[PDB]
Structures are given as C-alpha cells and as structure tokens.
Design a protein around this nucleic acid. Structure first.
Length: 276
DNA sequence: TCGACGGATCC
DNA sequence: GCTGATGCGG
DNA sequence: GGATCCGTCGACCGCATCAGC
C-alpha cells in the first residue's frame, strides 16, 4: 500500500513551538543527488541542520553548489581513509557547533567515513551511515562488531548530554518496518542479528525511535526503495533512516517526518522537529 | 524484488 | 574525455 | 502424474570507481 505522511506537528506535547529542524538524507551519491535537484529540495525545506549519508565524494571533489547554502554555512565532511567513491557523511549547520568529532574512537570502525559528532549547547547530534551486512551477508560478522562498538560509544555520549542520532542505520527494526519481511529474514538489514542489535541499542543507551514512538502502528512508512523492479512506485520499501532520541528529549519532540515525495536517491529524507 | 528454476509433496 | 569492467548497495 | 508448494538463485538500477588510453 502507498503511504501519505501526516502534516508537520510543530508544537511540543506542552505546546512549545519547535525551535530546531533537522533533516537527514542518505543521498547515495552527493554529486548525482545535486544534479537531481536535491539541494533545491533542501532549500525549500529550509532545515537548521542537514545530515547526509553515503556521499561517495571525497573532500577534494565536493561540488561548488555546497558553498552557496548560507543557512547551512558550517559544513563538516568525513570520507573513508583509503576507499574512494565509498560511504562518506556530511553535517551542515546554520549555527556553528561547539565541537565536532569524526568517528567513534575505535580504530577498526573509524576508517570508512561513517560518523560525525556535533555537540551543541543542549544536545549532541550524531549522524551515521551504518555498515551494510552485504550481499550474501559477507559483512554480517563485521556488522555485529560495529553494532556493539557503536552502542558502547553512544551510551558514553548520552551519559553526558542528551543525544540525537540520525542517519541510515541499515536495519528495519520490526516487520512493520518493511514491505516484505517474510522473504528478507536472511538478507542484509533484516537478519535477526541486525534486529537484535537495534533492539539492544534502543535499550542500552537508551534511545527511543522517534517516528515509531509517535506512529507506533502506522504501516508502509519507508525511507528506502531499491532502484530495481520499480519498487518505489509500488512502495515496496524499508524504513532504514531514523531519528533516535534520548528519552529526556521526548517531551521536546514535536514530530518525526518521512519526506516520501522528495526524489534524488534511493532513500527519501527524514525530518525532525524539536522544541529546545 | 522479482520470476524462474528445481525438488518435494498432496490430492 | 571515453570505453568497458568492477564494487557496492538493501 | 498434474498441480501446488517452498527454499534457492540470479538478474534488473544507479552511482562511482578502476584500468587503459
């Protein structure tokens, strides 16, 4: 079935107006995504913070258009140490952060340009491109090690400041989170190991799944569709892109959106409204 | 994500 | 710059 | 022995690389 995202709720559970708009987008090729009008859609949407994953573009080759975004003037990028065209993430912000960090503090997990950490006044933002378990599950063993290291890192962070985590987490948590759960239990992104990892991450940090907390029983809400088989036009998709929040931020939560109609990638953008 | 292959089983 | 092959993705 | 039924498999889309000029 096809999905319409409900209207943006911009007031908190206590009616505070939203003060912060964060958009996350796994662009799957920054240069292509710009040619496909992605920055235009970003301008229409006008977020305070914009997080990009799977940029596949080293720092040298960053397009010029990115320096024409004055609402996102503070810009940070991470590319793999020695794998061109692969992975990559960016964080662009209206206001400068207090401090920015790359990686999670673990050598084996910090070589593929997957994590940027931006500390602001009242919270810390992490944007992440989690490793795919791979076709045939070649990297499932690796992914389990990452999941544990990432969880351990996020727990540390959330013990010092309220934490917002966004990006492609490369798992559909539950059967409601993808169109074809039955035929995907052995495929990357819906293995029990990946689902267990996600569950443990929600419990251990702890974090709440912003979208599922507001729409706990809403089916067919996905952030990714394979380019093949006309899957997007059939809404045969997976929810892979999340905003996970520290529980303290839940009364700051105004809404968590799926921007289903924005084209430019095999992921659509997600948007988070907080009253901070 | 399909649809095509089997091999398997049941009426 | 252009072809043709390969890596990677969920 | 004709149909139906499940695991298993291999190709499609798209972006960016690399090898070779």
């Amino acid at each position: 079935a096809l999905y319409e995202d409900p209207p943006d709720q911009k007031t908190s559970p206590s009616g505070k107006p939203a003060t912060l708009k964060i958009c996350s987008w796994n662009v799957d090729g920054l240069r292509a995504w710009i040619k496909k009008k992605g920055l235009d859609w970003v301008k229409e949407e006008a977020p305070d913070i914009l997080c990009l994953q799977q940029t596949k573009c080293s720092e040298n080759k960053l397009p010029a258009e990115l320096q024409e975004l004055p609402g996102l003037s503070h810009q940070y990028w991470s590319a793999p140490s020695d794998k061109e065209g692969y992975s990559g993430v960016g964080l662009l912000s209206r206001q400068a952060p207090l401090k920015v960090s790359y990686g999670i503090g673990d050598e084996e997990h910090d070589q593929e340009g997957r994590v940027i950490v931006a500390e602001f006044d009242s919270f810390v933002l992490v944007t992440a491109y989690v490793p795919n378990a791979g076709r045939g599950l070649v990297r499932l063993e690796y992914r389990q090690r990452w999941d544990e290291a990432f969880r351990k890192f996020l727990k540390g962070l959330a013990s010092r400041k309220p934490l917002v985590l966004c990006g492609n987490l490369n798992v559909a948590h539950e059967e409601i989170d993808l169109r074809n759960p039955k035929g995907n239990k052995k495929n990357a992104g819906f293995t029990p190991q990946e689902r267990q990892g996600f569950g443990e991450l929600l419990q251990a940090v702890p974090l709440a799944d912003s979208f599922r907390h507001l729409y706990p029983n809403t089916p067919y809400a996905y952030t990714f569709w394979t380019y093949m088989m006309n899957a997007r036009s059939k809404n045969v998709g997976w929810r892979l892109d999340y905003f996970l929040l520290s529980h303290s931020l839940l009364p700051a939560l105004c809404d968590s959106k799926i921007r289903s109609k924005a084209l430019g990638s095999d992921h659509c953008p997600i948007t988070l409204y907080l009253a901070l």
